[PDB]
Amino acid sequence: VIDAINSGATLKDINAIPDDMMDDIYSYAYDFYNKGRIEEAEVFFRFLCIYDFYNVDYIMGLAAIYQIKEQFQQAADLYAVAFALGKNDYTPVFHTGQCQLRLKAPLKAKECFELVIQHSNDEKLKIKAQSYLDAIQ
């Protein structure tokens, strides 16, 4: 672990916890999230992101908790990283648009939702993005 702290590497890189156990921890983090146990979900998603900062779903989980907690800028920061780590997935850009509206930045929000509609292949996501655009003055 110390070596990974000094070399900047992840705990996942050194197989510090077996993979099936990490799956279980992610499932439990999601259970806490779905049950509204936000404090515990936050601990578990922070734990996961320490373990593997390059895991898009771990990042997205922590970003979602920050958004629920109305830490909108912190959520938007993580969503930008999640977009870069993902597989052509514009869901983090969609949630960034929601964060920008809550930050009273509607032109930034519009740009996010427009990006989703122009580049995403996720039809359900684009429908949602369009509904936000429909509402944005």
Ligand X SMILES: NC[C@H](O)c1ccc(F)cc1
Site residues for Cl ion per CB under 5 A: 71, 73-74, 89-90, 98, 105, 107-108, 120, 122
Assess 2 for contact with a copy of itself (CB under 8 A): yes
DSSP label at residue 37: -
Distance of alpha carbon 108 from alpha carbon 124, whole angstroms: 22
SS (H, E, C) 54-91: CCHHHHHHHHHHHHHCCCHHHHHHHHHHHHHHCCCCCH
Of 108 and 128, CB closest to a copy of itself: 108
Q: List the single partner that 49 binds among a copy of itself, Mg ion, ligand X, none, CB under 5 to 8 Å by kind.
A: a copy of itself
Assess 85 for contact with a copy of itself (CB under 8 A): yes
Q: Which stretch binds Mg ion (CB under 5 A): 3-11, 27-35, 82-90, 118-126?
A: 3-11
Assess 111 for contact with a copy of itself (CB under 8 A): yes
Among 29, 56, 112, 116, binds ligand X (CB under 6 A): 112
Alpha helices in the chain (DSSP H): 2-7, 19-34, 38-51, 56-68, 72-85, 91-102, 106-119, 123-135
Of 62 and 93, CB closest to ligand X: 93
